[PDB]
């Protein structure tokens, strides 16, 4: 049983007592604050709204549990029982909050308002920032989605250059991060964010999250194929690596199959086992069912280059229309070790320099894709910008002397299209002057109800690359 | 509805067809592989066992769901329905797996076996590595707990050097990481791992996790106190920062309270607002209810030093018995911005060089404590070391030519004390020779039941620093 009264930073329990007396409105906003990563993919809030914020989230039992925990945690009575009982009694435990947000999947430059939060009942001035902690966790799917999309830009550039098209782009970066993230819940959230940009995942948890909270016309949003792990090779004994290979590719003779080849000696496995002993089992495979050789250790770029060099001398290589070398269609490579946005760039650039098409390879990333990210990468941040006290609205902000990068926006915010068609955030309620057309934010939550939502297919369309669009 | 059949890496669905035929046993182990962070706190497996692995985790409905999803995900029928049905029918859907583990809270050098996993029924040879993905997520609480203990070591060394004792050590690094982690579940797991070493947290999700899965004699494992955030200051308006401060310290006159002081100009706030205009409300406070001034921007060390210098000129400083300067007891500082293990060390060393006692300060860490960590930090890894095929045991391993650091251990494993009282992992079943006393791994899970558990109190005892001891 999740309890929203226990889902905040401890000190926020004490804040109701700290605002100016007679404050009736607290209005706050989220941005990826300006400080690469010039634009962000807005994704993930719809999950939070539905799983944690909508409907009857306050009960008499949840109030008593919070009172009991906070009494001990603070060694004192500081919990706002009265305020939460008000919500329970007046709104049948539905939050009197309104959230406006940019559509999911939207790609927006840094430093723009992405969502706003305000209370809808003056008695609940304290509630806006109570839920800061839970809403700010949107940084994670935004950040995964964004960093995944930045890797797609890299892959698109180099695939276009070396092959002349983008065929298969959406399967070039596979999610291997299930084991490397910090929890099951994170696994589903992060896997779903990667699927905004790609279709290949081993993180099965993402599929159910998307089905429940977003939806796709297709039965599932992402796909995989059979593959070995080191245990299914090493179990055969060190002298029987050939036997394991032969067994695995025969068991999966008619579908694609990846086979990890570096248990003992990747270069031997490629040149002597695959390239000589078992070559007859590879060159007979369908283009729809290639063997995908998997190195998994050594310098990522050097190992890929050396594997391709070996395979190129044992198998028939062609020269595609762009002048780049291409393995036969029954043979590919996957690099699933040490991949993050930086090493991905190094590997594709290294391949290009050695005249190997990016058609030859795909990448898997795990920790780099889903875990090695923090809230500082995009400076995702929630701040109060407007309050009403004693009936007077006031524009508020922070502006720390030693760090102008932490300055926050002032007053009521709105998001607009500029005359050149770009985004701009207007501060101080200036959107009301109607000089920049309509506010692009939409009301997505009001008074315990989700009022606007997006399918996963729409989110993917919104998050497309300009090259894909053109 | 969590479904263990859908809680693995997709490719593991296909592995049952890949092992050698006539394989009746797959035995695997977890270590924090050797390649800084020389020892690790084993913590978190009991959570995973209870939440996800115990009891009736296979049902007819879960089998059908898995079958339906994998048909679409693979665009093919490759799911082992027959093996999952067997578990359902023979064992009432309980997992035929035995897991042996070092006790939680144990502090073990890198490169040692921490737990092992094996199937208890020959038909379920494939199940040992099915649950790799879920068990390997133990890397996270191990790493949080380990990194938090390493920070407690730094604080202990500097507190002892500048003050002569460890009083309040367990409150010197507070968890501010709730907003900065990737999910609610991570929050609870990560906050609980930090609580192995400290008692201060704002990540309330940790408390419920510990109560449900571990348990403490005391009502709760962690504590906090009132504090401002920027909104409760800025809401007053720029010209009314002093009004906000005055209001807040008066609301919380008799308990400790932290007050963020950098909304506009931290140095002004310290020297003029706290140091002059509101000084009379500070110097009257109880030593049990100090004001804790919070800077939150700028270079973390330079800002701490400048704040201490400002305060030291507006308030009565003493020199403690070690020669270090000490604010009056009603006034302390908390640095909650930019703290990780590296910057923590820089700040305390900077303070020591400027003759400020670590008694003066506490630290809060959020993303650095709970998010900015990966499975590569301690090389937490799960590998098969032993199989039985055709009734013959075979010791198996990887040893990639280009990276000896990824070599794995061979055979059946056990963990022992050495004659000097250190730890050693015996390979190749050599523990059976009984030359090294009893195995320190204990059966913690077998055939769907959790067989040995630890209280959070025991875990804390096991994870103590030697200096505490
Ligand atoms: O490398 S693994 O052993 N594989 C794996 N899953 C199988 C796999 C194999 C091949 C590719 S691929 O990207 O080459 N790929 C996917 C899509 C492609 N086609 C499918 C649609 C059109 C292109 C087939 C090949 C992607 C994924 N999981 C792992 C998890 C953790 N570590 C390692 C691995
Ligand atoms: O800085 S905050 O505004 N505070 C806060 N919680 C209050 C707080 C205040 C002071 C200390 S402390 O370490 O000084 N401390 C002193 C008193 C307490 N006593 C418990 C027994 C002995 C000391 C221990 C914790 C720790 C924690 N939460 C935040 C969350 C996110 N960012 C910032 C903050």
3-state secondary structure chain B: CCCHHHCCEHHHHHHHHCCCCCEEEEEEEEEECCCCCCEEECCCHHHHHHHHHCCCCCCHHHHHHHHHHHHHHHCCCCCCHHHHHHHHHHHCCCCCEEEEECCCCCEEECCCEEEEEEECCHHHCCHHHHCHHHHHCCHHHHHHHHHHHHHHHHHHHHHHHHHCCCCCHHHCEEECCCCCCCCHHHHHHHHHHHCCCCCEECECHHHHHHHHHCCCCCCCCCECCCECCHHHHHCCCHHHHHHHHHHHHHHCCCCCEEEECCCCCHHHHHHHHHHHHCHHHHCCCCCCCCEEEECCCCCHHHHHHHHHHHHHHHCCCEECCCCCEECCCCEEEEECCCCCHHHHHHHHHHHHHCCECHHHEEEEECHHHHCCCCCCCCCEEEEEEEEEECCEEEECCCCCCCCHHHCCCCCCCEEEECCCCCEEEECCCHHHHCCCCCCCCEEEEECCEECCCCCHHHHHHHCCCCCCC
Which one, of B467, B183, B128, lies nearest residue A137 by Cα?
B183
Instruction: Decide: B175 and B206 in contact? Cβ < 8 Å.
Output: yes
- State the DSSP code for A227: B
Give the closest ligand to the alpha carbon of residue B333: 2
Nearest beta carbon to residue B180 from set A7, A367, A375: A375
Please give the DSSP secondary-structure letter assigned to residue A269: I
Give the strands of the sheet with A97-101, arranged side by side.
A392-395, A380-389, A23-32, A113-119, A97-101, A442-446, A449-450
A172 vs A334: CA distance, rounded Å? 9
| Residues B66 and B78: beta-carbon distance below 8 Å | no
Query: Which of A324, A331, A326, A328 lies closest to A353, judged by CA?
Result: A324
What separation in angstroms does the CA of B336 have from each of A24, A31, A56, B163, B367? 30, 21, 34, 22, 11
CA of A306 to the centre of ligand 1 (A): 21
Contacts of B390 (CB under 8 A, 6+ apart): B22
| Residue nearest atom 20 of ligand 2, based on CA coordinates | B171
Best residue of A4, A9, A49 to probe chain B, by most B CBs closer than 10 Å:
A9
Interface of B with A in 109-128 (CB under 8 A): none
- Token pair of B262 as six digits: 């950098």
Kindly write down the DSSP assignment for every residue of A389-449, as one continuous string: ETTEEEE-----TT-GGG----SS-EEEE-TTS-EEEE-TTGGGG-SS-S---EEEEETTE
**CA–CA separation, B89 vs B71, rounded Å?**
23
In the structure, which protein residues have their CB atom closer than 6 angstroms to any atom of ligand 2? Answer: A 9-11; B 168, 171, 174, 176, 200, 202, 223-225, 227, 256, 258, 260, 292, 294, 332, 334, 336, 362, 364
**Residue of B168, B116, B114 whose CA lies nearest to B145:** B114
Helix (H, G, I), strand (E, B) or coil at A98: strand
Rounded to an integer, what distance in angstroms lies between the CA atom of residue A151 and that of residue B286? 56
Collapsing DSSP to helix, strand or coil, A332 comes out as strand
Q: What's the rounded Cα separation, in Å, for the pair A366 and A343?
A: 13
Mutational test site, ligand 1, from A180, A288, A334, A371, max ligand atoms within 8 Å of CB = A334
The residues near B298 (Cβ < 8 Å, ≥ 6 apart) are: A400, A402, A403, B262, B266
Closest by Cα among A182, A137, A97, A125 to A9? A137
Q: What DSSP line would sit under A140-158, residue for residue?
A: HHHHHHHHHHHHHHHHHHH
Structure letter (DSSP) for residue A103: P
Contacts of A278 (CB under 8 A, 6+ apart): A242, A245, A246, A249
Q: Rounded to a whole number, what is the distance in angstroms from the first to the last CA of chain B?
A: 44
Distance from C-alpha of B194 to C-alpha of B148, rounded to nearest angstrom: 6
Q: Identify the CA nearest to B201 among candidates B51, B372, B369, B335.
A: B369
Interface contacts A/B by beta carbons within 8 Å: 326
d(CA B57, CA A6): 29
8 A C-beta contact, residue B116 and residue B27: yes
User: Is A367 part of any known ligand binding site?
Assistant: yes
Contact, B162 vs B324, CB < 8 A?
A: yes
Nearest residue in chain B measured CA to CA from A135 = B179
Q: How far is CA B335 from the centre of its chain?
A: 21
Helix axes B81-91, B60-74, angle to 10 degrees: 170
Measured CA to CA in angstroms, residue B28 lies from A183, B94, B401 at distances of 21, 19, 22
Distance CA B211, CA B242 (A): 41
Q: Identify the three-state secondary structure at position A385.
A: strand
Q: Which atom of ligand 2 is nearest to the CA of B332?
A: 14
Dihedral sign, Cα of residue B311, residue B154, residue B300, residue B186: negative
DSSP label of A95? -
Residue B431, min C-alpha distance to chain A (Å): 22
The tokens of A230 are what? 């080191």
Residue for token pair 């076996």? B113
Cα(B70)–Cα(B73) distance, integer angstroms: 5
- Which residues, 6 or more positions from A82, have their beta carbon under 8 angstroms from its beta carbon? none
Q: Which ligand is nearest to the CA of B290?
A: 2
Does the distance separating the beta carbons of B176 and A224 come in below 8 Å?
no
Task: Burial-class residue A250 by CB neighbours within 10 Å (0-12, 13-18, 19+).
Answer: exposed
Q: Encoding tokens for residue A73?
A: 């945690």
Q: What are the backbone angles phi and psi of residue A325, rounded to the nearest 5°?
A: -80, 140
Report yes or no: A259 and A270 within 8 Å, Cβ to Cβ: no
* Annotation: binding site of B: 179, 202, 230, 294-296, 336-337, 367, 375
State which residue of chain A sits closest to B29, comparing Cα positions: A231
CA-based nearest residue in chain A for residue B380: A180
- Classify A379 as helix, strand or coil: coil
Q: Tell me which residues of chain B, numbers 168 to 187, contact chain A at a CB-CB cutoff of 8 Å.
A: 176, 178-186
Interface test with A, best of B7, B183, B272 (most A CBs within 10 A): B183
The tokens describing B377, both together, are 């930090």
Instruction: Find how far residue B26's CA is from the centre of its chain.
Output: 29
Q: What are phi and psi of A337, to 5 degrees?
A: -120, 130
Report chain A's terminal Cα–Cα distance, integer Å: 48
Q: From the annotation, which residues of B make up the binding site for beta-nicotinamide D-ribonucleotide? A: 202, 294-296, 336-337, 367, 375
Contact list in A for residue B244 (CB cut-off 8 A) is: 18, 20
Structural domains in chain B plus CATH codes:
1-136+375-453 (no CATH), 137-374+454-469 (3.20.20.70)
| Ligand 2 atom closest to the CA of B168, numbered from 1 | 22
| B residues 312..351 contacting A (CB < 8 A) | none
Query: Residue B394 has which token pair?
Result: 């075979």
Q: Using CA atoms, how far apart are residues A188 and B22, in angstroms rounded to an integer?
A: 36
State whether residue A276 sits within 8 Å of chain B by CB. Answer: no
Ligand lying nearest the CA atom of residue B224: 2
What is the sign, positive or negative, of the torsion defined by CA atoms of A113, A213, A449, A447? Answer: negative
β-strands A39-41, A423-426 pairing: unpaired
Distance separating alpha carbons of residues B105 and B127, to the nearest angstrom: 27
- In terms of Cβ atoms closer than 10 Å to its own Cβ (0-12, 13-18, 19+), residue B399 is middle
Task: Tell me phi and psi for residue B369, to 5 degrees.
Answer: -80, -40
Check the CA dihedral A371-A43-A184-B70 and report its sign. Answer: negative
Task: From A135, A130, A128, A95, select the one nearest A26 (Cα to Cα).
Answer: A128
Q: Which residues of B touch A339 (CB under 8 A)?
A: none
Are B278 and B293 in contact, with CB atoms under 8 Å apart? no
Whether the CB-CB separation of B398 and A296 falls below 8 Å is answered with no
CA distances from A119 to A126, A451, B28, B208, B230 (A): 8, 16, 53, 28, 18
B184-194 vs A184-194: helix crossing angle, rounded to 10: 140
Give the integer Cα–Cα distance in Å for B3 and A411.
Answer: 46
Note which residues in 58-97 of chain B have CB less than 8 A from chain A: 69, 72-76, 78
Give nearest CA residue, ligand 1 atom 8.
A225
Q: Which of A14, A52, A397 sits opposite B227 (nearest CB)?
A: A14
Could you tell me how many residues make up chain A?
A: 470
> Any idea how long chain B is?
469
Return the ligand number nearest the Cα of B133. 1
Resolution value in angstroms: 1.5
For residue A266, CA distances in Å to A118, A300, B193, B330, B403 come to 58, 13, 39, 65, 11
Q: By the 8 A CB rule, do A13 and B210 touch?
A: no
């Amino acid at each position: 049983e999740f309890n929203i009264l226990l889902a905040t930073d401890s000190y926020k329990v004490t804040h109701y007592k700290q605002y100016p007396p007679n404050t009736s409105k607290v209005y706050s906003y989220f941005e990826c604050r300006e400080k690469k990563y010039e634009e962000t993919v807005f994704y993930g809030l719809q999950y939070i709204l539905n799983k944690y914020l909508k409907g009857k989230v306050v009960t008499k039992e949840k109030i008593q549990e919070a009172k009991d925990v906070y009494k001990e945690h603070f060694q004192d009575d500081v919990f706002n029982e009265k305020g939460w009982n008000y919500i329970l009694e007046k709104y049948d435990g539905h939050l009197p909050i309104e959230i406006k947000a940019v559509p999911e999947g939207f790609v927006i430059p840094r430093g723009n308002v992405l969502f706003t939060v305000e209370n809808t009942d003056p008695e609940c001035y304290w509630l806006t920032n109570w839920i800061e902690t839970i809403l700010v966790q949107s940084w994670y799917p935004i950040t995964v989605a964004t960093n995944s999309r930045e890797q797609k830009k890299i892959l698109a550039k180099y695939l276009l250059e070396t092959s002349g098209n983008l065929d298969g782009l959406e399967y070039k970066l596979h999610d291997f991060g299930y084991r490397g993230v910090s929890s099951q819940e994170t696994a589903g959230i992060g896997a779903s964010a990667h699927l905004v940009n790609f279709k290949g995942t081993d993180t099965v948890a993402g599929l159910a999250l998307i089905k429940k909270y977003y939806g796709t016309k297709d039965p599932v949003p992402g796909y995989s194929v059979p593959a070995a792990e080191h245990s299914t090779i090493t179990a055969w004994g060190k002298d029987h690596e050939k036997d394991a290979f032969e067994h695995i590719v025969t068991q999966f003779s008619s579908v694609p199959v990846s086979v990890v080849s570096d248990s003992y000696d990747i270069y031997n496995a490629c040149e002597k086992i695959w390239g000589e002993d078992l070559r007859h089992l590879i060159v007979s495979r369908s283009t729809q069912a290639p063997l995908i050789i998997r190195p998994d250790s050594g310098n990522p770029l050097d190992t890929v280059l050396k594997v391709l060099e070996i395979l190129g001398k044992k198998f028939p290589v062609t020269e595609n229309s762009k002048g780049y070398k291409l393995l036969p269609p029954y043979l590919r490579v996957i690099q699933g070790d040490g991949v993050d946005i930086n090493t991905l760039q190094e590997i594709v650039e290294g391949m290009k320099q050695k005249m190997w098409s990016i058609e030859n390879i795909a990448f898997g990333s795990g920790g780099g894709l889903l875990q090695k990210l923090t809230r500082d990468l995009l400076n995702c941040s929630f701040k109060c910008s407007y309050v009403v006290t004693n009936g007077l609205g006031i524009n508020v902000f922070k502006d720390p002397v030693a760090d102008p990068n932490k300055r926050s926006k002032k007053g009521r915010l709105s998001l607009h299209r500029t005359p050149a068609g770009n985004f701009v955030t207007l501060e101080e309620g200036k959107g009301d002057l109607e000089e920049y057309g309509q506010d692009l934010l939409h009301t997505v939550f009001k008074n315990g109800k989700v009022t606007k939502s997006y399918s996963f297919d729409e989110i993917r369309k919104n998050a497309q690359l300009n090259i894909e669009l053109e």
